[PDB]
Design a binder for this molecule. Structure first.
Ligand SMILES: [Mg+2]
Ligand SMILES: [Mg+2]
Lengths: 184, 176
């Protein structure tokens, strides 16, 4: 399916997709800073429009499960340093986070790169999100820049996802905040 | 086999940095390498500092790391590339800003050693000469971890023109 998408892309689109995957943070910090709206730096806007179009030429062949690790900063300043107390999740504060989050639809302003489980799921960061991406969704497989697994699944910017469930996974020497979500 | 010299919790913290280095380094960069805006993180950082002091390179080595263009700041990060190429005029300015100068890396400085391959798919590729006698610990295919606030002189900066891309190359020497 990496091959099917690649055959649909122009030469400049392939270059651009690779440019993004290898240099993702500056694209995504720009998008997040402006809540997914363009017009702030017209030059990067030009690339973003082309990357959007490249991704529109992709269509997922079947429904798939993918995942993302994140640190606690994705929750904002109030939760970032208070959601963990030492190595355990703050139970009272988690309650507040879950009520704030669960059942609701969120938007990721940046492009959404996700990993695919082969024989392993790399869940060492404090937050783990699994996402169900429906058949037919715009989503393209890309070369992973960690040379870990071969491919990642790249979703459009402004992806909307519903948080279906949220809970704490208690491990032997850590606790993980687990987010289960479905892409709209 | 530097692991022998480490206390128990020192090994554990090296492990924790491995599992999630981004909070450490983001914190350190945001505070320009000064503690301590956030006391609980500072306690870990101090322990990790101690662990790294317990190692010493017996010989000078070459290491490398790839980076995204955010290391050049907001005014360059999204303009230094145009049309899959490095903008030459902006690169002149960037080179003027950095080449020949001693920089401080506020975060810990994770680096890779070339065996068979050098993974340089990221737009920036930095190679560093790390001198004999430098504090630097080997951690888990192993990476070399240098202390925070490592100073390095940028010796040369140039654009490597590849078949299908351009790479910003930075060649640096770690200072004592
Ligand atoms: Mg554990
Ligand atoms: Mg190339």
């Amino acid at each position: 399916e990496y091959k099917a998408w690649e055959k649909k892309l122009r030469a400049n689109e392939k270059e651009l997709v690779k440019e993004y995957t290898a240099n993702a943070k500056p694209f995504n910090t720009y998008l997040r800073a402006n809540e997914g709206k363009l017009g702030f730096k017209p030059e990067i806007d030009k690339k973003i429009l082309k990357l959007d179009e490249a991704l529109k030429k992709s269509k997922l062949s079947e429904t798939v499960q993918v995942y993302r690790g994140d640190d606690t900063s994705i929750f904002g300043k109030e939760f970032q340093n208070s959601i963990y107390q030492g190595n355990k999740v703050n139970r009272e504060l988690f309650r507040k986070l879950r009520d704030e989050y669960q059942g609701k639809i969120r938007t990721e302003y940046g492009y959404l790169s996700t990993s695919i489980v082969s024989n392993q799921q790399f869940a060492m960061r404090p937050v783990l999100t699994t996402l169900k991406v429906p058949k037919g969704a715009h989503a393209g497989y890309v070369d992973k820049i960690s040379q870990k697994g071969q491919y990642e699944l790249l979703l459009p910017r402004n992806t909307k996802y519903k948080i279906d469930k949220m809970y704490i996974i208690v491990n032997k020497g850590s606790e993980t905040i687990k987010i289960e979500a479905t892409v709209q």
